Amino acid sequence: ESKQIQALRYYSAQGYSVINKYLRGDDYPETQAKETLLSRDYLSTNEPSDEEFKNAMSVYINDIAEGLSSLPETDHRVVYRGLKLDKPALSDVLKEYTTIGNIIIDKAFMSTSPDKAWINDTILNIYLEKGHKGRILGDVAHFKGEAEMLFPPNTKLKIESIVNCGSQDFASQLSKLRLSDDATADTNRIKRIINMRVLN
Q1: Of 9, 148, 180, 197, which residue is the catalytic one?
Q2: Cα 117 to the chain's mean position, in Å?
Q3: Given 106, 143, 149, 189, which is the most exposed site by the fewest CB atoms within 10 A?
Q4: Where does this protein reside within or beyond the cell?
Q5: What is the rounded distance in angstroms from the CA atom of residue 23 to the CA atom of residue 151?
Q6: Domain membership of residue 108 as a residue range
Q7: 96 an active-site residue?
């Protein structure tokens, strides 16, 4: 098993919790980032310089991305994601994702499912064209039995349409999605569907 796949396994288990905030330019767990770099030997101490830290994070991210890229391609042409976009703090994110024809860049690794969306205020219905960079994790995923298609950083997507709750159009579109039916599933929580397309 390549060391890159092993880095992707770690991403799936725990590294995601640090890396994606880092990549977004958000506040992230700095101490944990450094502890990860030390434990996986990208650095010799947990107290590096800022350039040593940045360079090591780069290699770590690139290992995860390369592990991902090396996984087999599949024939999926759509995937799904539930998001919470109705938080006050995400108001500009909400506006971006609900601007028809907007092109958005996801700076982080982007997790999606080929099989179902977990209900949230927003359901993304994400169309894919052949040759896209998403890969099914399969047994690389830490927890098994939930299909996941992961995309590397900087996925570009186009907002094609937005379907708000409370019409037959919405009801029909929603009925043609497979949703999570877990213990807390409630479709009445859904405010919108956003139909998107990854631009390769």
Answers
A1: 148
A2: 12
A3: 143
A4: Secreted
A5: 13
A6: 1-200
A7: no
Could you say which of 9, 81, 135, 197 is catalytic? 81
Annotated active-site residue 148? The verdict is yes
Residue 95, CA distances (Å) to 81, 99, 153 in order: 18, 6, 21
Tell me how many domains the chain contains.
Answer: 1
Catalytic residue status for 180 = no
Q: CATH number, domain at 103?
A: 3.90.176.10
The residues, ordered by sequence, that sit 6+ positions from 68 with a Cβ below 8 Å of its Cβ are 8, 109, 135, 150, 152
CA distances in angstroms from 169 to 12, 101, 125, 163, 165, listed in the order given: 36, 20, 15, 7, 9
Q: What is the resolution of this structure in A?
A: 1.5
Q: Tell me which of 35, 111, 161, 189 is the catalytic residue.
A: 111
Q: Which two tokens stand for residue 19?
A: 């890396």
Q: Which of 43, 47, 23, 19 is nearest to 33 (CA)?
A: 19
Solved how? X-ray
